[PDB]
Write a protein that binds this ligand. Structure first.
Ligand SMILES: Nc1nc2sc(CCCc3ccc(C(=O)N[C@@H](CCC(=O)O)C(=O)O)s3)cc2c(=O)[nH]1
Ligand SMILES: NCC(=O)N[C@@H]1O[C@H](COP(=O)([O-])[O-])[C@@H](O)[C@H]1O
Ligand code: NA
Length: 200
C-alpha cells in the first residue's frame, strides 16, 4: 500500500512509521510526506529518509475544501492508498474525509472516547485519571469518533505534566501506529460494510 503521512510538527510518529515501513515484511511504503507548516522538523526527518516532501500552507487557501482539495491533488499525484495523520493539526473537510473513508488513519493521545480534541493531555491531567493512553482510529467525519483500530494504555504518574505524560504516551504511539498501519496495509483490518471495523 502506498502511504502518505501528513504532519504539522516534530515528526516522531512519522519517524516511527518510517522505521517500521523499512522492515522487510512491511506491507506499507511511505511515498510522500505533506506538512501544512514550513521549517517543521518532520520535514527534515522525511528528507533525511529520502522521502519526498510537500508543504501545503492552509493560509494561501480561502476555505478548507480548497485547502484539502490541494492535498488530495498531491495524494492523487503520488497514487496514494492510505493517508496517515501523524501530528497533523488541521480538521479535514467532509468530502475529503468521505472520499478517504476507510483509508485514513489518525493517532490521538488519549484512550478515546475520553479527551477528544487538541489538548488531550491537559484534559487527562485536569481530570485526574491514573491511566491514559493513545488511539489509532479511522478518520470519520466527526472528530476522534471514527472506528478504533488500536489502543495502548499508559500510566499517569504522580506529578506528571504535559511534558512528561506526553513523553511517556509517545512511546506507546510509536508502537501502535506502525502496527495499525501494518494491519490496514495488509488488508487484515478494514472498515466493514456495516461501518464498524472488520478483521480478516
Ligand atoms: N473530520 C476529521 N478531521 C480530522 S483531522 C484529525 C487529526 C486530529 C487533530 C485534531 C484534533 C482536534 C483538532 C482541532 O480542534 N483543531 C483546530 C485547531 C487548528 C490548529 O491549527 O491547531 C482546527 O483545526 O480548527 S485538530 C482528526 C480528524 C477527525 O477525526 N475527523
Ligand atoms: N489531536 C491530535 C494530536 O493531539 N496529535 C498529537 O500530536 C503529537 C505529534 O507528535 P509528532 O509530531 O512527534 O509525531 C502526537 O503526540 C499526537 O498524539
Ligand atoms: Na486527534
Amino acid at each position: 500500500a502506498r502511504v502518505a503521512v501528513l504532519i504539522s510538527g516534530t515528526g516522531s510518529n512519522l519517524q516511527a512509521l518510517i522505521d517500521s515501513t523499512r522492515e522487510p515484511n512491511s506491507s506499507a511504503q511511505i511515498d510522500i510526506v505533506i506538512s501544512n507548516k514550513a521549517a517543521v522538523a518532520g520535514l527534515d526527518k522525511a528528507e533525511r529518509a529520502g522521502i519526498p516532501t510537500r508543504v501545503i500552507n492552509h493560509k494561501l487557501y480561502k476555505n478548507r475544501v480548497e485547502f484539502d482539495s490541494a492535498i488530495d491533488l498531491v495524494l492523487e499525484e503520488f497514487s496514494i492508498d492510505i493517508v496517515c495523520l501523524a501530528g497533523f493539526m488541521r480538521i479535514l473537510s467532509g468530502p475529503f474525509v468521505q472520499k478517504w473513508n476507510g483509508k485514513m488513519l489518525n493517532i490521538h493521545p488519549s484512550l478515546l472516547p475520553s479527551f477528544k480534541g487538541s489538548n488531550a493531555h491537559e484534559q487527562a491531567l485536569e481530570t485526574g485519571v491514573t491511566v491514559t493512553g493513545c488511539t489509532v482510529h479511522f478518520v470519520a467525519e466527526d472528530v476522534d469518533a471514527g472506528q478504533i483500530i488500536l489502543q495502548e494504555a499508559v500510566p499517569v504518574k504522580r506529578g506528571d505534566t504535559v511534558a512528561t505524560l506526553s513523553e511517556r504516551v509517545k512511546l506507546a504511539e510509536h508502537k501502535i501506529f506502525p502496527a495499525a498501519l501494518q494491519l490496514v496495509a495488509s488488508g487484515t483490518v478494514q472498515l466493514g460494510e456495516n461501518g464498524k471495523i472488520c478483521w480478516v
